[PDB]
mmCIF file of C-alpha atoms and ligand atoms in Angstrom:
data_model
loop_
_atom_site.group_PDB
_atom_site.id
_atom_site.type_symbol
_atom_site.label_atom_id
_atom_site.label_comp_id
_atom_site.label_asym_id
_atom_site.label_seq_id
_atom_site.Cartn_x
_atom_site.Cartn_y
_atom_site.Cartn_z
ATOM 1 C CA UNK A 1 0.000 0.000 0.000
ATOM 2 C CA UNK A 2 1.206 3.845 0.661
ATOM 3 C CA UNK A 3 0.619 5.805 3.567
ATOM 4 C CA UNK A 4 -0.559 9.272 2.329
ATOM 5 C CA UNK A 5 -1.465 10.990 5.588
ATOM 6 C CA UNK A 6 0.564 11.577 8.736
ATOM 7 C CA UNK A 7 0.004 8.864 11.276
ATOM 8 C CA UNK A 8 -0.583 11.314 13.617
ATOM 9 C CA UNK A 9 -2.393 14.052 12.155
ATOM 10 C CA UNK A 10 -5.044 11.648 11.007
ATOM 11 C CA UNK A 11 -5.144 8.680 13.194
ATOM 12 C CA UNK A 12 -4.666 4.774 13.299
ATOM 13 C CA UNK A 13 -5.879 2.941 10.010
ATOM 14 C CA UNK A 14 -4.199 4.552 7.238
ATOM 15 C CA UNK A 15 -2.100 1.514 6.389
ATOM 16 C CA UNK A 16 -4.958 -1.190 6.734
ATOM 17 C CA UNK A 17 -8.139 0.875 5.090
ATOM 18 C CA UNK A 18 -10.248 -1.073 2.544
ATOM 19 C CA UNK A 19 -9.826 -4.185 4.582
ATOM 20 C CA UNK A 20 -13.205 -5.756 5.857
ATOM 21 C CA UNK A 21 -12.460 -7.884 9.023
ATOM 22 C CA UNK A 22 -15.092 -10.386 8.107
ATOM 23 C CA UNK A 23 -13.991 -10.734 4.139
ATOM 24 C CA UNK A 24 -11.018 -9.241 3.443
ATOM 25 C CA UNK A 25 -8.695 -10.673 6.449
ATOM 26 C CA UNK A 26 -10.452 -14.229 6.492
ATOM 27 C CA UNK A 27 -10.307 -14.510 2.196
ATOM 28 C CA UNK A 28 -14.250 -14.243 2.346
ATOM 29 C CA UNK A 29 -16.206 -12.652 -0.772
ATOM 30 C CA UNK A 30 -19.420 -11.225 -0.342
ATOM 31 C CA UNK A 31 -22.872 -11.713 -1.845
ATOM 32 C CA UNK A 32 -22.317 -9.205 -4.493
ATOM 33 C CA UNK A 33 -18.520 -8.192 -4.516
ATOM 34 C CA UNK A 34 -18.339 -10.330 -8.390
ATOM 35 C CA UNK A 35 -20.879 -7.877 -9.999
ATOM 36 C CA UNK A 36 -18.517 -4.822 -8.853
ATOM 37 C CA UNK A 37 -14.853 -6.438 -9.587
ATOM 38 C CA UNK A 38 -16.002 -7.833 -13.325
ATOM 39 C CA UNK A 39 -17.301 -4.231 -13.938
ATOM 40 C CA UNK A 40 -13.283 -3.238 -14.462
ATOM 41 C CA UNK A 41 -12.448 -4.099 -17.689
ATOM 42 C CA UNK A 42 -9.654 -1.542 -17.378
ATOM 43 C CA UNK A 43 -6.069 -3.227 -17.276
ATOM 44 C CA UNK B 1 -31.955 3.558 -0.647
ATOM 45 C CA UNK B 2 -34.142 2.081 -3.426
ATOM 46 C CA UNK B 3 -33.932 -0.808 -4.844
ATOM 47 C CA UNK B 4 -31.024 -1.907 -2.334
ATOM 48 C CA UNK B 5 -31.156 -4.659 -0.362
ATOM 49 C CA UNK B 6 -29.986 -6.164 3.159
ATOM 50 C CA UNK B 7 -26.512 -5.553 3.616
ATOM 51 C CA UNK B 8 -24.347 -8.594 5.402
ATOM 52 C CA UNK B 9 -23.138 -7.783 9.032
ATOM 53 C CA UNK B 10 -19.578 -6.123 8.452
ATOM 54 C CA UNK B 11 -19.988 -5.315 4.607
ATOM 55 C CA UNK B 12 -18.802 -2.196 5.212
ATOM 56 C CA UNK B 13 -17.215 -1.428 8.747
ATOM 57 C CA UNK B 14 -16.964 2.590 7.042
ATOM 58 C CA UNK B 15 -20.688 3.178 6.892
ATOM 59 C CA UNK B 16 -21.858 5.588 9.494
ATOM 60 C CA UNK B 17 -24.464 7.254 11.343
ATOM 61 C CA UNK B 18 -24.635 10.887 11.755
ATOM 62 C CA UNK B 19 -27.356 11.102 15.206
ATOM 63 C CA UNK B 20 -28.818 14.696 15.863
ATOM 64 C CA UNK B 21 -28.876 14.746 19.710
ATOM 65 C CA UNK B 22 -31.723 16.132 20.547
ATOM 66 C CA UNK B 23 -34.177 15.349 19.549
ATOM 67 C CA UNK B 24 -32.986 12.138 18.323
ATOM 68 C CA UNK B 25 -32.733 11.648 14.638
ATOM 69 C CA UNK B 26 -31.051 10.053 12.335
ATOM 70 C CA UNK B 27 -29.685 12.625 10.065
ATOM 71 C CA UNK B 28 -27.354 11.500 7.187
ATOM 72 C CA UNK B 29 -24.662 8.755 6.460
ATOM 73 C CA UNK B 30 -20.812 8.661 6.891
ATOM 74 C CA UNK B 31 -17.480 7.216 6.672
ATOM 75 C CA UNK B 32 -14.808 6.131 8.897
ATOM 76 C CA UNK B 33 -11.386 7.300 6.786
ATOM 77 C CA UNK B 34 -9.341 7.089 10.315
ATOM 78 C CA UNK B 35 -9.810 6.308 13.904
ATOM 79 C CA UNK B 36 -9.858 10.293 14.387
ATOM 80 C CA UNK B 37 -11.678 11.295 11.349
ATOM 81 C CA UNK B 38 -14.773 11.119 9.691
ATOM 82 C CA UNK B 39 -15.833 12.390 6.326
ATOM 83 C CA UNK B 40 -19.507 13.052 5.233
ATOM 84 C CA UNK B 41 -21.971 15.616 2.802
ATOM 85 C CA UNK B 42 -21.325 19.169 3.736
ATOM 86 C CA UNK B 43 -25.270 20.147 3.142
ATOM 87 C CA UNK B 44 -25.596 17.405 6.018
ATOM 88 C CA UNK B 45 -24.213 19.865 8.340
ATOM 89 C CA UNK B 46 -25.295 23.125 6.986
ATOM 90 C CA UNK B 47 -28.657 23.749 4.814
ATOM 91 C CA UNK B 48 -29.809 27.458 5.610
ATOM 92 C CA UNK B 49 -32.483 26.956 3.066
ATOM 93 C CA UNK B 50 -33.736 24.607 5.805
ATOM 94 C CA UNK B 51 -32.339 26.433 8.863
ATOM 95 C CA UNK B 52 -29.859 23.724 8.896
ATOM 96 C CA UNK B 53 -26.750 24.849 10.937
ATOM 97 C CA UNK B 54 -25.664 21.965 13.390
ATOM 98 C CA UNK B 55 -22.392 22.576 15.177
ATOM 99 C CA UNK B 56 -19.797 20.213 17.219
ATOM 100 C CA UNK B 57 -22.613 19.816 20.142
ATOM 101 C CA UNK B 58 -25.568 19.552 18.128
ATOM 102 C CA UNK B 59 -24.972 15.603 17.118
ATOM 103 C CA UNK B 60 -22.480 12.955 17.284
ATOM 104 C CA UNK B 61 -21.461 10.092 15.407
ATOM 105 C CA UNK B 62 -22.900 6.366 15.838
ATOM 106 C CA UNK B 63 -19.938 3.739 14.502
ATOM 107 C CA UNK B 64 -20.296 -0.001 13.488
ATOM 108 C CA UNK B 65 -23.981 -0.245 13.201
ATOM 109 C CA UNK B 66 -26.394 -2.533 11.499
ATOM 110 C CA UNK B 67 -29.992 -1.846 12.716
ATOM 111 C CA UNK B 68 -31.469 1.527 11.780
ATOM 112 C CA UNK B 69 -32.934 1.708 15.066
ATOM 113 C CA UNK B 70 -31.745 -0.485 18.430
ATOM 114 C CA UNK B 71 -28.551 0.245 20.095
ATOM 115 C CA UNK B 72 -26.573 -2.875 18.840
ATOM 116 C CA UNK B 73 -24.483 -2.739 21.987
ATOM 117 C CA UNK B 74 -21.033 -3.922 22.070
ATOM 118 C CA UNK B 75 -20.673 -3.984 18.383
ATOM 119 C CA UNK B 76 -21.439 0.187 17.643
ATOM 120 C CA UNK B 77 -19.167 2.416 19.216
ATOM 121 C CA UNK B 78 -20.785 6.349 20.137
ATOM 122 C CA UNK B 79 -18.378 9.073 19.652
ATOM 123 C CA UNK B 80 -18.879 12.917 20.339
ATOM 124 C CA UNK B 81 -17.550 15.655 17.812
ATOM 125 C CA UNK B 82 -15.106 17.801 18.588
ATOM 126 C CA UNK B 83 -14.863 19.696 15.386
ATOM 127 C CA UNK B 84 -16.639 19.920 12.276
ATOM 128 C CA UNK B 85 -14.870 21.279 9.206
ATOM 129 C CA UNK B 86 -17.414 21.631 5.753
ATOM 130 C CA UNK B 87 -15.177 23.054 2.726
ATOM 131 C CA UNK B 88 -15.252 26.774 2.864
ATOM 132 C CA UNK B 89 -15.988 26.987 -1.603
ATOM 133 C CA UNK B 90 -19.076 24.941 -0.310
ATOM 134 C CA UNK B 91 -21.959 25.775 -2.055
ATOM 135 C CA UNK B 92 -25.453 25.165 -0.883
ATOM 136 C CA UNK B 93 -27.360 28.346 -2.472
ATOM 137 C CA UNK B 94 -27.287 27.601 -6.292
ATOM 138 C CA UNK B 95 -25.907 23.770 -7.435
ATOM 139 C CA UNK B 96 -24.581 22.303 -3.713
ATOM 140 C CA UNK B 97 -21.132 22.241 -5.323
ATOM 141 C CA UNK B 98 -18.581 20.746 -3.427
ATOM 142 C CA UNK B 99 -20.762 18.966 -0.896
ATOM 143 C CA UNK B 100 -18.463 17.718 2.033
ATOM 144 C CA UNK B 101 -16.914 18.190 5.529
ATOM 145 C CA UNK B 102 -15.211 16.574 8.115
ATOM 146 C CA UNK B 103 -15.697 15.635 11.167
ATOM 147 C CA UNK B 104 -13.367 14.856 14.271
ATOM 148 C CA UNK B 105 -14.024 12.631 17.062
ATOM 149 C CA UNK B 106 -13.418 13.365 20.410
ATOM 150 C CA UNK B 107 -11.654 10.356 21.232
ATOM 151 C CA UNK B 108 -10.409 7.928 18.925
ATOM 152 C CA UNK B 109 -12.816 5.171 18.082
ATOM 153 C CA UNK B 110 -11.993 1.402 18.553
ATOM 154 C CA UNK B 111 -11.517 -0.437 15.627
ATOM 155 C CA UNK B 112 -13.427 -4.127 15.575
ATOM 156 C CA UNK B 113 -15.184 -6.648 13.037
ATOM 157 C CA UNK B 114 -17.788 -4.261 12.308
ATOM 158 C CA UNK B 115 -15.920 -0.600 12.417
ATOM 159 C CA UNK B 116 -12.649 -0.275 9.817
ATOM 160 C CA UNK B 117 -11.793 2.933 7.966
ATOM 161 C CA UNK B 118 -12.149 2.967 4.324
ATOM 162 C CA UNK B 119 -9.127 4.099 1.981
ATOM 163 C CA UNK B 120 -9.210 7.725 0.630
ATOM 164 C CA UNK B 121 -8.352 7.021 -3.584
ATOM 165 C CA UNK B 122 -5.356 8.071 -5.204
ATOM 166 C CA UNK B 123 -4.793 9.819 -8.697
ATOM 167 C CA UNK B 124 -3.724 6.102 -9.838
ATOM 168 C CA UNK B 125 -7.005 4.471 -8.717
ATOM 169 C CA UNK B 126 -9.438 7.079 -9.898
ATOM 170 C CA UNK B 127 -8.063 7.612 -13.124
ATOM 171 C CA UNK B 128 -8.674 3.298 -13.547
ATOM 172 C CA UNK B 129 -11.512 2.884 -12.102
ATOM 173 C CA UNK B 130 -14.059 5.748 -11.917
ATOM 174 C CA UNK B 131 -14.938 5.849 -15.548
ATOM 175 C CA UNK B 132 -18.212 5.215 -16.930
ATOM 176 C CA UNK B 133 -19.880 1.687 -16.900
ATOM 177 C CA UNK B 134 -17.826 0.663 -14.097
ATOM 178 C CA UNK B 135 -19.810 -0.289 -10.840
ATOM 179 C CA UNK B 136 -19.521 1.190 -7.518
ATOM 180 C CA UNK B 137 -21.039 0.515 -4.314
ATOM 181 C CA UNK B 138 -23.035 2.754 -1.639
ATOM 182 C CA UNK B 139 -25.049 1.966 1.169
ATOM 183 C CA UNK B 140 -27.685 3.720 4.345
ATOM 184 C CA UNK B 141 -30.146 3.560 6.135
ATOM 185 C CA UNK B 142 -32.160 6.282 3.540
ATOM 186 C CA UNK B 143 -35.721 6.048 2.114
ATOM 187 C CA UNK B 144 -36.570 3.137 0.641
ATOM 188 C CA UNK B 145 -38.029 4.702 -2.365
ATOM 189 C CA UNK B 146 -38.533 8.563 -3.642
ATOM 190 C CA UNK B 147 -42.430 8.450 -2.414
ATOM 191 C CA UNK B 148 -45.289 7.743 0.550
ATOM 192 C CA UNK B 149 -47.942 5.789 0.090
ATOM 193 C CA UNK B 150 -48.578 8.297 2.766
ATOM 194 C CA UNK B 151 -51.186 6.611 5.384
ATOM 195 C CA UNK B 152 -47.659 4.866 5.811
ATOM 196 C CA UNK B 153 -44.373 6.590 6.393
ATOM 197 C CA UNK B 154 -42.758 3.359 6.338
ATOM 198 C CA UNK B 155 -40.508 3.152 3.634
ATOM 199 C CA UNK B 156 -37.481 3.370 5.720
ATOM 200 C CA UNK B 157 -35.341 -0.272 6.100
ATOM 201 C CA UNK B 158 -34.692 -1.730 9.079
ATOM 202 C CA UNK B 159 -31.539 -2.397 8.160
ATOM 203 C CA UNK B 160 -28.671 -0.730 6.184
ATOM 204 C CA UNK B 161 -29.371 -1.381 2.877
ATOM 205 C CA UNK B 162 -26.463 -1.547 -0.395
ATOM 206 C CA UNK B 163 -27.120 -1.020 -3.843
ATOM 207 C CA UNK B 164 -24.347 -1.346 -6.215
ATOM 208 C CA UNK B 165 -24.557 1.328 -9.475
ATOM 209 C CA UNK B 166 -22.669 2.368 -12.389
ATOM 210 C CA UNK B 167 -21.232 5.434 -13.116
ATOM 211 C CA UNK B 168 -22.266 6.958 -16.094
ATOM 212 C CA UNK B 169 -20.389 9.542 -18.676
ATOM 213 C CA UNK B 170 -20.333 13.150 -17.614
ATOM 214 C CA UNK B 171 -22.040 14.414 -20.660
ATOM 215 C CA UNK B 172 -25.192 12.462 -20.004
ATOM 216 C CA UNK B 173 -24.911 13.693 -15.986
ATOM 217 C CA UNK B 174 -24.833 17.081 -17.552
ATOM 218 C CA UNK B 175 -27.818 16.613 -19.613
ATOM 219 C CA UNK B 176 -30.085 14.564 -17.085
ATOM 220 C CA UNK B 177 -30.579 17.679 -15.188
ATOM 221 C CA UNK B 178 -31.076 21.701 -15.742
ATOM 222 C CA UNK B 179 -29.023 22.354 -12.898
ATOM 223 C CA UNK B 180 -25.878 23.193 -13.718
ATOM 224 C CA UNK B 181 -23.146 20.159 -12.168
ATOM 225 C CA UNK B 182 -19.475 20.940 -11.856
ATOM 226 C CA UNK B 183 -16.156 18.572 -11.850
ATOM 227 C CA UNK B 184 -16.625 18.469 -7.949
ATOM 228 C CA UNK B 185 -19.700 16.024 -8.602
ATOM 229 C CA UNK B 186 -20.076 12.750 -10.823
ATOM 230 C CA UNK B 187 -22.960 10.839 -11.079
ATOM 231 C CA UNK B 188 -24.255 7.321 -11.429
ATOM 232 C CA UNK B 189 -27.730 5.148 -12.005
ATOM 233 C CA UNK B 190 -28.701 3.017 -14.608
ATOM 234 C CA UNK B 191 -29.801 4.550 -17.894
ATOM 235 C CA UNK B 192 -30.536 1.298 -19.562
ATOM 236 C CA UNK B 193 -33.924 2.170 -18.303
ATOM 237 C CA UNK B 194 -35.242 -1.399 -17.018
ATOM 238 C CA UNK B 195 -32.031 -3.541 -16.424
ATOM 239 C CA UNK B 196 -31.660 -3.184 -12.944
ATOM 240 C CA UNK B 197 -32.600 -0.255 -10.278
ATOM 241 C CA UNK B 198 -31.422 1.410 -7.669
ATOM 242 C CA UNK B 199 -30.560 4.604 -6.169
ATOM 243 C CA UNK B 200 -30.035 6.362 -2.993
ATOM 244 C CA UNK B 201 -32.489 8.442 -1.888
ATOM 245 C CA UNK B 202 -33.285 11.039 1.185
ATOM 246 C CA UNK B 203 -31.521 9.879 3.788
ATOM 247 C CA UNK B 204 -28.248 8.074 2.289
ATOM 248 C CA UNK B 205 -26.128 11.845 1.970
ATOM 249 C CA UNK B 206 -22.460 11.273 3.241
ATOM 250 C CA UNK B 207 -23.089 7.630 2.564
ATOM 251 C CA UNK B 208 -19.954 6.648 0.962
ATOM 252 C CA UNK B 209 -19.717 5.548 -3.082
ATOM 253 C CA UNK B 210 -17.432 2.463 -2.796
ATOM 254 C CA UNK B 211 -15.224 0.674 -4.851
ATOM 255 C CA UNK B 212 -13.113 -2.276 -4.552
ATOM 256 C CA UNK B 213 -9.827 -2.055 -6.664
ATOM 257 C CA UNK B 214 -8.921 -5.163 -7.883
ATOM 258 C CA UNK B 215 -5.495 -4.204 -7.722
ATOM 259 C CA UNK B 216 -4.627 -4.509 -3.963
ATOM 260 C CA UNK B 217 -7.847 -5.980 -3.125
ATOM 261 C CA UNK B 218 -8.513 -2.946 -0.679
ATOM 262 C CA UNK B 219 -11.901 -0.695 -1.211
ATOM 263 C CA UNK B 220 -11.796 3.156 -2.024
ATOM 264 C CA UNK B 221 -14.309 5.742 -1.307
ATOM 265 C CA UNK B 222 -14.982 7.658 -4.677
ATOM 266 C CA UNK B 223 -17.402 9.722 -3.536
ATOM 267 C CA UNK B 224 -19.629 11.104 -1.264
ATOM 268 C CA UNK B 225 -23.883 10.770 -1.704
ATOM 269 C CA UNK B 226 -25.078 14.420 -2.461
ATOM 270 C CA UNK B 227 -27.843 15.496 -4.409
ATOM 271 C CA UNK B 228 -30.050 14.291 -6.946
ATOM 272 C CA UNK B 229 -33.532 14.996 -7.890
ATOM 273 C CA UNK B 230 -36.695 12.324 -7.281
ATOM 274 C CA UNK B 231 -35.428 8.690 -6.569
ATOM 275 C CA UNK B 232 -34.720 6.360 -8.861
ATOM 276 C CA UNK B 233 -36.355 8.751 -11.651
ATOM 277 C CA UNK B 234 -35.977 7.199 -15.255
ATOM 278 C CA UNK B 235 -33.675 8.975 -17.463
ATOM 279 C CA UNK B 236 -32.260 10.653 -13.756
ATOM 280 C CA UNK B 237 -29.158 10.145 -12.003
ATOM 281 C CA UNK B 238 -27.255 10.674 -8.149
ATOM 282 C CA UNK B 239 -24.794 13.175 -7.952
ATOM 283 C CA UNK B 240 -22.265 12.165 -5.362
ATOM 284 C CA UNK B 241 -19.516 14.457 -3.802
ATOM 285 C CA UNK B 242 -15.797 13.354 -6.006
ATOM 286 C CA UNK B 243 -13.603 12.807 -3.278
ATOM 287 C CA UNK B 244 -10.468 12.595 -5.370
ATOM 288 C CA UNK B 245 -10.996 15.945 -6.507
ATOM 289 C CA UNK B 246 -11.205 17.554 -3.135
ATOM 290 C CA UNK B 247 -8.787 15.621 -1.894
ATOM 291 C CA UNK B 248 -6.440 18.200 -1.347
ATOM 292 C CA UNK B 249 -8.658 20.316 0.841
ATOM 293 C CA UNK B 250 -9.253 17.256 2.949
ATOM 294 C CA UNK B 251 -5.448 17.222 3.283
ATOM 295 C CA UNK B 252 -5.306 20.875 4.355
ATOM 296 C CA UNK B 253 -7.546 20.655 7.072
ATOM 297 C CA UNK B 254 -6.402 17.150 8.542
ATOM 298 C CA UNK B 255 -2.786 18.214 8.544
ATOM 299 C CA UNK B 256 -3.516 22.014 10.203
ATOM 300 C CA UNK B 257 -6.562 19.597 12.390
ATOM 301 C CA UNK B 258 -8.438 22.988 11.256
ATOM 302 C CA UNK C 1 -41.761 26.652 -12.754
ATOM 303 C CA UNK C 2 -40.044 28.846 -10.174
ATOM 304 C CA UNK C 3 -36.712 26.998 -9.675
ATOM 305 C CA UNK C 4 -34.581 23.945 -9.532
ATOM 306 C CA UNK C 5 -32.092 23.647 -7.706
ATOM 307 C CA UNK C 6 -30.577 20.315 -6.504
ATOM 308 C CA UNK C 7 -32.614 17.896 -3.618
ATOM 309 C CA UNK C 8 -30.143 17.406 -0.827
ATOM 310 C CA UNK C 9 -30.211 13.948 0.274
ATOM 311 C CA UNK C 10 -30.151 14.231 4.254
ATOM 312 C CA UNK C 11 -33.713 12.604 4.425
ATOM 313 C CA UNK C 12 -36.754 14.921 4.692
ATOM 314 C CA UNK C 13 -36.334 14.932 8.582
ATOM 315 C CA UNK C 14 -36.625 18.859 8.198
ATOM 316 C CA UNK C 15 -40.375 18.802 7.071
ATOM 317 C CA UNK C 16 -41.763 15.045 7.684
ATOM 318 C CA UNK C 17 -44.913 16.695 7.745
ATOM 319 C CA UNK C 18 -45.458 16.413 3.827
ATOM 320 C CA UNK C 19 -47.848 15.794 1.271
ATOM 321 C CA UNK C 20 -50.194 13.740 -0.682
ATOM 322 C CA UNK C 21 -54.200 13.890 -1.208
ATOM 323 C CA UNK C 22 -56.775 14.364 1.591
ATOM 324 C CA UNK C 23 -57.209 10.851 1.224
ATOM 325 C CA UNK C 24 -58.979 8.912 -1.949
ATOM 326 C CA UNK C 25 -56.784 6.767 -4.835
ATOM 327 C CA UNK C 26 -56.044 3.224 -4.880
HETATM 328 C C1 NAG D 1 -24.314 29.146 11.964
HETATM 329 O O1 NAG D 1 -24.454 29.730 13.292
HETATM 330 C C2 NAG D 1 -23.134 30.220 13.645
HETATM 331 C C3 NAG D 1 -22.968 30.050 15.153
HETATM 332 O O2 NAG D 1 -24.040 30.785 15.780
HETATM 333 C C4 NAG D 1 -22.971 31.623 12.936
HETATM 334 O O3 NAG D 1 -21.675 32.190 13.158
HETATM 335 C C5 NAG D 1 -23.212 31.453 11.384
HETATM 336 O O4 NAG D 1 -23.676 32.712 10.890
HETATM 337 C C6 NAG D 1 -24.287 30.342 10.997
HETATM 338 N N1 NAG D 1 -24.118 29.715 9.655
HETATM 339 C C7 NAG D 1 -24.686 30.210 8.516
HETATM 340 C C8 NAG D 1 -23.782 30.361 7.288
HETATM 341 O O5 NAG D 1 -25.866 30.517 8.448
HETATM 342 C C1 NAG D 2 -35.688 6.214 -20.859
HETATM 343 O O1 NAG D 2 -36.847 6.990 -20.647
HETATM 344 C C2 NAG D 2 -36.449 8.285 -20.273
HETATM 345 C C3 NAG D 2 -37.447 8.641 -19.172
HETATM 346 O O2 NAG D 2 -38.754 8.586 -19.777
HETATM 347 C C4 NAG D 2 -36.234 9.090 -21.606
HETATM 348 O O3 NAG D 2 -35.807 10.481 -21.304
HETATM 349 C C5 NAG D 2 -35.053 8.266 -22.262
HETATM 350 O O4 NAG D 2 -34.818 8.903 -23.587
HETATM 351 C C6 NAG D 2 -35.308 6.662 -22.310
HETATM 352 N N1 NAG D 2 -34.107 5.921 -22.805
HETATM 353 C C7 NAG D 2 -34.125 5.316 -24.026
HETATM 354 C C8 NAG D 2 -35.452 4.872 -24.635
HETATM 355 O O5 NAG D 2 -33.082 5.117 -24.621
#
């Protein structure tokens, strides 16, 4: 990843954002995740 | 939000509540981008049209929920505001151009299963994946659908809903609507006219417009639920807040805090 | 008519007390 913000101007997270703790950590996708990832056709 | 449905526990650990005090009420969505921060609509927080000027006191934020109503205790986590911060250019008397603000929480809130930020996009993920015909996400606890079968003001879920929608090309935005939208604002709905449905509707502002970049695998908050007219109106598309683009304000006021 | 200018999304919260018919449709 890359941290962008100052870890402490803007608080714990930065480095682990966009990672569900019921999906994400434990490999898990959800009902509709499939419609969103096979809408990006872009390389 | 219409045409939505029930989202699993933890689908997104970002969405939040923003509570009015007193009296109670559930006001608009948000997001978690930090443990200290939390981003949201602007016209959430201040609507003089509506005599809509809350302040650090007037509400607080609700993190980690599921239910639109009970207190899910020991899952949501309560935190008071210590300052809010709406974007200065903000615009709320002619288009609601550049609808967003920040908001910073008293004391840091605990992350858990059911409360992790979401990641603020980069000029490398927007540029790839917010481009028409490619799906997003968004989700609230808004109005079901645009109208009341009145005798019944029950159109609101009882649990936060999802939708997923596509973004669709800025020229058509700009000609679905009179009003005049700006490059602060991108929209998305389904032109296709039948497909599929959906929509977010009174109720779902500051809800976060998600996507999940199937790059790193992590998801990105492309925008912010705005404006839009009717719900779910044929031949009418959301307007959402584009984060990227006032990205670097949000970087001003997190690194001066204000 | 007299207008347009965006609906904010916030839900109606700030006028609940809305409209319809004095009761009659199906
Ligand atoms: C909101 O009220 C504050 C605090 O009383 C005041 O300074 C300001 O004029 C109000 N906001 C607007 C733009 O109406
Ligand atoms: C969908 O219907 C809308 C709303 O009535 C109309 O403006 C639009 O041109 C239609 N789309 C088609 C038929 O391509």
């Amino acid at each position: 990843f890359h941290t962008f913000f100052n870890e402490k101007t803007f608080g714990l997270g930065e480095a682990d954002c966009g990672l569900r703790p019921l999906f994400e950590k434990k490999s898990l996708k959800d009902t509709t995740e499939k419609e969103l990832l096979d809408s990006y056709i872009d390389g | 939000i219409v045409e939505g449905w029930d989202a699993e526990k933890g689908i997104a650990p970002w969405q939040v509540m923003l509570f009015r005090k007193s009296p109670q009420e559930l006001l608009c969505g948000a997001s978690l981008i930090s443990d200290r921060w939390v981003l949201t609509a602007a016209h959430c927080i201040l609507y003089p049209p509506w005599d809509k000027n809350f302040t650090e006191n007037d509400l607080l934020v609700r993190i980690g929920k599921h239910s639109r109503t009970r207190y899910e205790r020991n899952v949501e986590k309560i935190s008071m505001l210590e300052k809010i911060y709406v974007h200065p250019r903000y615009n709320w008397r002619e288009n609601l151009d550049r609808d967003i603000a920040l908001l910073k929480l008293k004391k840091p809130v605990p992350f858990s299963d059911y409360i992790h930020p979401v990641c603020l996009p980069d000029k490398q993920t927007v540029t790839s994946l917010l481009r028409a015909g490619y799906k997003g996400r968004v989700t609230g606890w808004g109005n079901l659908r645009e109208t009341w079968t009145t005798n019944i003001n029950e159109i609101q879920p009882s649990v936060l809903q999802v939708v997923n929608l596509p973004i669709v090309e800025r020229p058509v935005c700009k000609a679905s609507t009179r009003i005049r939208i700006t490059d602060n604002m991108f929209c998305a709905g389904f032109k296709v006219n039948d497909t599929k449905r959906g929509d977010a509707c009174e109720g779902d502002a500051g809800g976060p417009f998600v996507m999940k970049s199937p790059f790193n695998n992590r998801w990105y908050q492309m925008g912010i639920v705005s404006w839009g007219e009717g719900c779910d109106r044929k031949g009418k598309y959301g307007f959402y807040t584009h984060v990227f683009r006032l990205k670097r304000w949000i970087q001003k006021v997190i690194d001066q805090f204000g | 008519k007299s207008s347009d200018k965006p609906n904010p999304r916030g839900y109606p919260g700030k006028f609940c007390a809305n409209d319809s018919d004095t009761l009659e449709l199906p």
